[PDB]
Amino acid sequence: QVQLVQSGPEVKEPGASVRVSCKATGYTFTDHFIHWVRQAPGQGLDWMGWINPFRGGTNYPQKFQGRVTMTRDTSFTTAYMELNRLRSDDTAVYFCARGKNSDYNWDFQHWGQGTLVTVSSASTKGPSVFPLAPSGTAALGCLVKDYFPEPVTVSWNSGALTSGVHTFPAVLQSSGLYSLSSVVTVPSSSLGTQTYICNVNHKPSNTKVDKRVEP
Amino acid sequence: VMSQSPSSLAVSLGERITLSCKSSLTLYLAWYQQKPGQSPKLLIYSTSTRESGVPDRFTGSGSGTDFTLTISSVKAEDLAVYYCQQYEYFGGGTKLEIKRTVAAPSVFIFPPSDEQLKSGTASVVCLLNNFYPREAKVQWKVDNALQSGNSQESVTEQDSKDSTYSLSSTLTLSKADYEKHKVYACEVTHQGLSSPVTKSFNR
């Protein structure tokens, strides 16, 4: 099958460059253009340009022309998208894409999984985890505060508690650090006896924290 | 520029839905479906052609600069964002969500933990749990002084089971600023509440 597999997440400071790779397998690489489409957080799809792997020729939209550079390595069946002089609103998931047919370039039947690029001068930092203590249903939680970059993951009771859990999208604070809450609603009668522990993973910092949440 | 209206639309399972896209011509149309965390999936191309395996409850139409995507009977797996596309251009998309009955927030307030205060910061969390529709207003009051600019909100995507939303608001002070005051309250306004709800505590 046509398969497009992209490189992993990146974190870059403003003014730097990032280079995202799209390995295309399962078809004759030089027979189709490779496109790049990005999607800022919560926004729509934004076409960034295409490359013809046959001789490396490119076209870019005016909004990116002087800033994006697409290349390919035909022997490695991989397209590359490098975006220069990065700004914070370049924070986005970047997709490579391929058309249904050589005929019509623009029917994007095939997509990579996307690469998240975060543009920030913030430094990698693991979160602090504080309990949201409960006061016949009770709410309790965990505040996962002050971390960079995304993502963190949260489970409750090592994955055993899943019903009634809400883990919120992180908010970007004015400090440049992220912060997130995870809450769960439980029978109030369970408060004294059943233990409630949130498990927080932040791999970019190799932070693993468990916080027991007590009344 | 291409445009889609409306940006979101509450639908009920089984009903007939029409999504609109407006183009412009100075040189045909494709539709994509995207669910959270996934790449878009091609649904329609050449204005009306169905992509292999797309159910025929999806129909693309188009006339001049006006294009439509019709779902004759919306199913649970259709809940997603839909994008139109013409050459290098994409519409801003339309998110489908489930219409259900109004549900008031269940509101909870959390003081800062001692562990956080010991670190020098104080966050007060106001939790608005399992409400519908999504629109809701949180207003923080500190010793009855209305606050602005020291809180941030976060909302979950619609729940898969009960089709509700949940929202957190977090008021974040310095410890010294938090200790200067007594009464912390979050006031919640929402369509399912006859008058605003307030959850408060005295530190």
Author numbering:
A (entry chain A): 1 to 52, 52A, 53 to 82, 82A, 82B, 82C, 83 to 100, 100A, ...
B (entry chain B): 3 to 27, 27A, 27B, 32 to 207
The authors write:
Contrary to most other anti-CD4-BS antibodies, they recognize the CD4-BS primarily through their gene-encoded CDRH2 domains, although their CDRH3s also contribute to this interaction.
To assist in model building of the cryo-EM structure, a crystal structure of unbound mAb 8–24 was obtained at a resolution of 2.01 Å, in which the long CDRL1 is disordered. Importantly, 8–24 neutralized eight of nine heterologous N276Q viruses when produced in 293S/GnTI− cells. Thus, antibodies 8–24 and 8–27 are more evolved than 8–8, 8–16, and 8–21, and bind the VRC01 epitope on functional Env spikes, when the overall length of the glycans around the CD4-BS are short.
